[PDB]
Amino acid sequence: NLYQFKNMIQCTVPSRSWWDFADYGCYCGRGGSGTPVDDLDRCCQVHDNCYNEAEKISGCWPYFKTYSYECSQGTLTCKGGNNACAAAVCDCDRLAAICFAGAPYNDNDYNINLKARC
């Protein structure tokens, strides 16, 4: 569920306010298309793709379905016992939260002119 994803980003990118990822590049935030603007945007692109794949599981609604996970220090894990939809959504969220921590965040890529730049 979105709340859990938020908590994962809060946990993997402590130095950046969690809400900074909501409207970044061509893919971070509601929807997305075009060529990713940088590595962070590519992380979002793959996350978007990941959710699309999870949605193929009947009745699997990524923003809603809750899953079991833990985030402590140097660990972010999806726990067992998650059903197929929760396991797929947790992995998409875990891997994106991690990927976000590997990419430079460029303030020039926040809230861009989508028509011109994507």
What Å distances lie between residue 16 and 9, 71, 93, 118, CA to CA? Answer: 9, 17, 17, 24
Q: Which of 2, 22, 23, 102 binds Ca ion (CB under 5 A)?
A: 23
Check whether 80 is labelled as a binding-site residue. no
Q: Is 59 labeled as ligand-binding?
A: no
The encoded tokens of residue 95 equal 């891997």
Q: Which residues neighbour 72 within 8 Å (Cβ) at sequence distance 6 or greater?
A: none
Chosen residue from 20, 38, 39, 48 binding Ca ion by CB under 5 A: 48
53 is a site residue for Ca ion (CB under 5 A): no
Q: Which of 47, 91, 107, 109 is catalytic?
A: 47
CB of 21 to Ca ion, least distance (A): 10
**In the complex with Ca ion, which residue's Cβ is closer, 17 or 73?**
17
Residue 6 to residue 72: CA distance in whole angstroms: 15
Catalytic residue at 93? Answer: yes
- 91 assigned to active site: no
Annotated binding residue at 29? Answer: yes
Q: Does 25 bind Ca ion (CB under 5 A)?
A: no
Q: By CB neighbour count within 10 A (0-12 exposed, 13-18 middle, 19+ buried), where does 104 fall? A: exposed
How far is it, in rounded angstroms, from Cα 34 to Cα 9? 24
Numbered residues of the known binding site for Ca(2+): 27, 29, 31, 48
Contact positions vs Ca ion (CB under 5 A)? 23, 27, 32, 48, 111
Which residues are known to be catalytic? 47, 93
